[PDB]
Amino acid sequence: VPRGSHMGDIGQLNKDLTDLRIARLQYMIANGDDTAAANTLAKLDAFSKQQAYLATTFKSPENVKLLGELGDTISAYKLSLNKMRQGYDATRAARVSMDSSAIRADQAMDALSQEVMARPEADSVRLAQYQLISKARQQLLQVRIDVRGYIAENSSANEQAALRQLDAALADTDNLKRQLPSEDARLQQFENAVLAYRDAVRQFRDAVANITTSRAEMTVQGADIVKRSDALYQIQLE
Amino acid sequence: GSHMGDIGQLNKDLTDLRIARLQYMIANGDDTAAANTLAKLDAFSKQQAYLATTFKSPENVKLLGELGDTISAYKLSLNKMRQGYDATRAARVSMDSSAIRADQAMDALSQEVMARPEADSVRLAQYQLISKARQQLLQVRIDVRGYIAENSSANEQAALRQLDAALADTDNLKRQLPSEDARLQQFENAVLAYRDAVRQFRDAVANITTSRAEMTVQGADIVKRSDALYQIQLE
């Protein structure tokens, strides 16, 4: 109620907003980690609290309505940010799942190779057998490398290359079952693991999509909160 | 109240610069994001210079001078970040080509062994060894890319360790298969070059982080000065 004071209240509102926008970008730079999640939620609530406070203090119909509009956009922001958090949780879960499925696949080919080599036979055929297994192993390590490339850089080109290469590995595994009919049980275990891996890569891809979507929404909500704040500020200054 | 208006533009411009520089890192140092950030910096700097010809008060022109000085430091720290992103980029292109060099060398070597009508038990023992080293390096590539995606000390150190273990096992396999020093030396040389590149990447990541810490601090400094310019005009 001091002269000039509401103008300062809005000054604080604007700083809190800037602090939120910066924190949210920092959160993405931190690859959505929990600590930066916590900081971002904090800045959001600080801004939310200021909006609520001023919603009590500002008297004029035009200002209270603007603060109300700000409140609605803050509500939407919270939801969008929640969606981004869920997306980061999902990318993390997909990565854990990709790692675990990768290990299963490797352990199965470990037993495929052993069982296959340790049965007595001609060394001409056993050298040919090992070329097949070796080819399969190296192929799947290349696939992980493509996927890791995609994890580091989220482009549609990295995505599609990893998916295509994964599909080629699954085609080749079905083909190895034909050339190693004794291990058809061991090979399907390998295949099941690689299929589970593909499922996880797909879940990772879908969650990246959700993170980018929520990002675009907060960007829009930001511009709208900025606009309304500017209007509040102009009423006071003038 | 027009001077108040000028400052508002300055402040709005600062915020736009900070958002821009953060977007640039999220974009992984993209040349396109880099152009946007340089553009936001130019706009802020132009506004500082415009006001330095406009504000007449010694108090204010001095503050604008100080603002300018911090803008000069920001431009240099921003330049250092750009050089760092360029460096991580070159290091990645280098790791890729070195990796392909190493694998091709081993693939030709294995074609060399399979081409020979040596006893198949000898051919096999050789092929298992070669294959195992090829795969060892693929797993290092997987650790390194893990590190490229998440730059943590944990990932860095694990990548370096596993890479030094591949190099140790490579020197050992050179003595185990003296029949090829030549081919194995090609491999080892490419793997050593790969290591050089991973180290270069690590060092550039560090420089990016350092430049970031610097602009973070310059930003806060620009805010104090810009806040003080604003309060003088509140009057």
CATH at A120: 1.20.1440.210
Same-domain pairing of A35 and A117: no
Our CA angle for A212, A216, A220, nearest 5°, is: 165
Chain A residues in contact with B128 by the CB 8 A cut-off are 130
A237 CB-near residues (< 8 Å, 6+ apart): A7, B1, B4
CA distance A137 to B138: 10
Compute the 3-state secondary structure of chain B and give helix, strand, coil in percent, each to the nearest 5: 90, 0, 10
CA distance B120 to B85: 50
**A137 touches A112 (CB < 8 A):** no
**B44 touches B74 (CB < 8 A):** no
Same-domain pairing of A3 and A45: yes
Nearest CA in chain A to B233: A237
Same-domain pairing of A188 and A215: no
* Structure determined by: X-ray
Same-domain pairing of B131 and B158: yes
Amino acid at B44: F
* Strand ranges for chain B from DSSP E: none
Same-domain pairing of B29 and B3: yes
How far lies A117's CA from each of A109, A123, A183, in Å? 12, 10, 12
Q: Ramachandran region of residue B118, left (φ > 0), alpha (ψ -120 to 50) or beta? A: beta
- Annotated resolution, angstroms: 1.9
Of A122, A127, A152, the CB nearest to B148: A152
Residue A118, chain B, CB below 8 Å: the answer is no
Q: For residue B145, give both structure tokens.
A: 């890319």
Same-domain pairing of A104 and A189: yes
**A127 touches B120 (CB < 8 A):** yes
How far lies A36's CA from each of A20, A41, A94, B191, in Å? 12, 9, 20, 37
Question: What is the residue range of B93's domain?
Answer: 88-203
Residue B138, chain A, CB below 8 Å: the answer is yes
Token pair 């806040």: residue: B227
Distance of CA B78 to the CA centre of its chain: 13
CA distance B178 to B172: 10
Task: Count other C-beta atoms under 10 Å from residue A162's C-beta.
Answer: 23
Least Cα separation, residue A123 to chain B (angstroms): 6
- Report CA dihedral (A82, A83, A89, A94) to the nearest 10 degrees: 170
Same-domain pairing of B130 and B193: yes
What is the sign of the dihedral through the CA atoms of B45, B9, A224 and A71? positive
Instruction: Report the run of H or E that residue A93 belongs to, with start and end.
Output: helix A61-117
Same-domain pairing of B93 and B181: yes
Same-domain pairing of A108 and A71: no
Same-domain pairing of A101 and A202: yes
Structural domain total, chain B:
2
Burial of residue A157 (CB within 10 Å: 0-12, 13-18, 19+) is: exposed
